[PDB]
Design a protein around this ligand. Structure first.
Ligand SMILES: [Fe+3]
Lengths: 39, 136, 204, 68
């Protein structure tokens, strides 16, 4: 919800965009965050 | 944020918490023989081989700043060059000068004897894939 | 829960018996069929498929002097039928149940072998009702066949028995085991992602 | 011709590999998968050694693959 507080500057929430890469592309399951390398 | 990034050379900053090369084992210090335009000269530097301080830094105490640390970009004989500017230097206080490192596996092995604490992977298998073309 | 992803192997009903001359004629190329002396014998058997993911069954044989059930020879699960009408010696209209998936693949005139429970004393084939019957035409669950076709006089049966069709199907190592060389065997089913059944825990 | 005791076969590979998973010692590593199939399970809590031996997950002398 901190996005909701971030949009506290709005003029009043629909969106349409592509993504800037994050850590989703999977090759090793992580039941907990051990972070990862980057190659 | 980008830190680890497997490579042919370790990304560790020399003397950091992971390279862990001793801060004292590689001390070098000497008073300035002559300050110059973006360059410094000292007797101790002459005793070292060329490029010994490439990526190193000089250290001393300023009557107000206290501790001051700034990098070295090149070394040769008694002469060195600094990445940053010169804030004024005097041939009094000794410049506690630290060597840098090529950051190669051979560099960390020979110079530092720290190969056992190295973060670079020499045998990154040329990204030998398991797709596209016949292999294995 | 993955919508039934399990494909591991498991035990299943099986039956074994000595390979008859008809089996050698059907499965043995004529180029080497001659020179099969009178002292030769062949092993054959059939078993039901326990799971859909099962592919075939490997045959483990531990003959006289052998150490451990050696894995040699494999067979395909033939169609199976459970006799449930207590047919008599001359019975022709075979009323049975348990119509296996492959039970309808037998063409008219095929050859099937009947049997009963086997155990100490019942292992002997001289008295045990082991009869080869030639299937004539299927009638749904009931199938029309002949009695005592090739190498067994027709006999009687009791409900809940087992009927196995063996035309062009079976499993053996193709070893000319000599007579009196009794061996102990265990048929192990196998699956793609589960491999073979327990290494040696299968019955014998 | 001769029986499978001496015949051409589907060919094994003989060499291993080395994988860099991620930074930092972790409390335990639980399970290892191959080709979207649950191959081996086990809690590894430190520098240790094990062996993966269920080659049956893919095949062998009658089917393709199978880690070991
Ligand atoms: Fe280093």
């Amino acid at each position: 919800m901190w996005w909701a507080l971030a949009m506290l500057v709005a003029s009043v929430e629909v969106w349409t965009a592509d993504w800037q890469v994050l850590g989703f592309g999977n090759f090793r399951t992580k039941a907990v965050k051990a972070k990862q390398a980057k190659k | 944020g980008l830190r680890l990034s497997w490579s042919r050379g370790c990304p560790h900053a020399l003397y950091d918490g992971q390279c862990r090369v001793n801060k004292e084992a590689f001390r070098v210090d000497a008073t300035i023989l002559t300050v110059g335009a973006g360059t410094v000269t000292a007797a101790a530097y002459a005793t070292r081989p060329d490029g010994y301080f490439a990526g190193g830094f000089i250290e001393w105490i300023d009557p107000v700043y206290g501790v001051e640390r700034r990098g070295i970009e090149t070394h040769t004989g008694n002469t060195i060059t600094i990445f940053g500017t010169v804030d004024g230097l005097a041939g009094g206080y000794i410049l506690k000068t630290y060597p840098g490192c090529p950051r190669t596996s051979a560099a960390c092995d020979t110079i530092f004897n720290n190969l056992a604490n190295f973060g670079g992977i020499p045998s990154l298998p040329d990204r030998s894939p398991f797709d596209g073309n016949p292999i294995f | 829960a993955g919508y039934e992803p399990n494909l591991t192997p498991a035990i299943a009903r099986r039956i074994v018996y000595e390979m008859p001359y008809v089996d050698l004629v059907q499965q043995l190329p004529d180029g080497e069929l001659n020179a099969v002396g009178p002292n030769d014998a062949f092993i054959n058997s059939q078993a039901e498929k326990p799971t859909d993911m099962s592919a075939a069954y490997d045959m483990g044989i531990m003959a006289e002097g052998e150490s451990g059930f050696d894995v040699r020879g494999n067979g395909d699960f033939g169609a199976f039928g459970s006799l449930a009408s207590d047919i008599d010696y001359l019975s022709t209209q075979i009323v049975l149940s348990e119509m296996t998936d492959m039970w309808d693949d037998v063409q008219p005139g095929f050859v099937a072998r009947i049997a009963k429970p086997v155990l100490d004393g019942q292992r002997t084939q001289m008295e045990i009702a082991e009869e080869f019957v030639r299937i004539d035409a299927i009638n749904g669950n009931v199938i029309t066949v002949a009695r005592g076709v090739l190498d067994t006089i027709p006999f009687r049966h009791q409900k809940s028995e087992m009927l196995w069709v063996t035309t062009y199907d079976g499993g053996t190592d193709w070893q000319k085991y000599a007579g009196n060389e009794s061996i102990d065997i265990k048929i192990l089913p196998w699956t793609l992602g589960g491999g073979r059944f327990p290494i040696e825990d299968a019955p014998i | 011709g001769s029986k499978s005791k001496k015949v051409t076969v589907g060919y094994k590979y003989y060499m291993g590999l080395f994988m860099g998973l991620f930074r930092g010692p972790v409390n335990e590593i639980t399970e290892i998968r191959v080709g979207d199939r649950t191959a081996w399970t086990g809690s590894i809590t430190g520098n240790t050694t094990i062996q993966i031996n269920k080659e049956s997950l893919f095949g062998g002398t009658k089917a393709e693959g199978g880690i070991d």
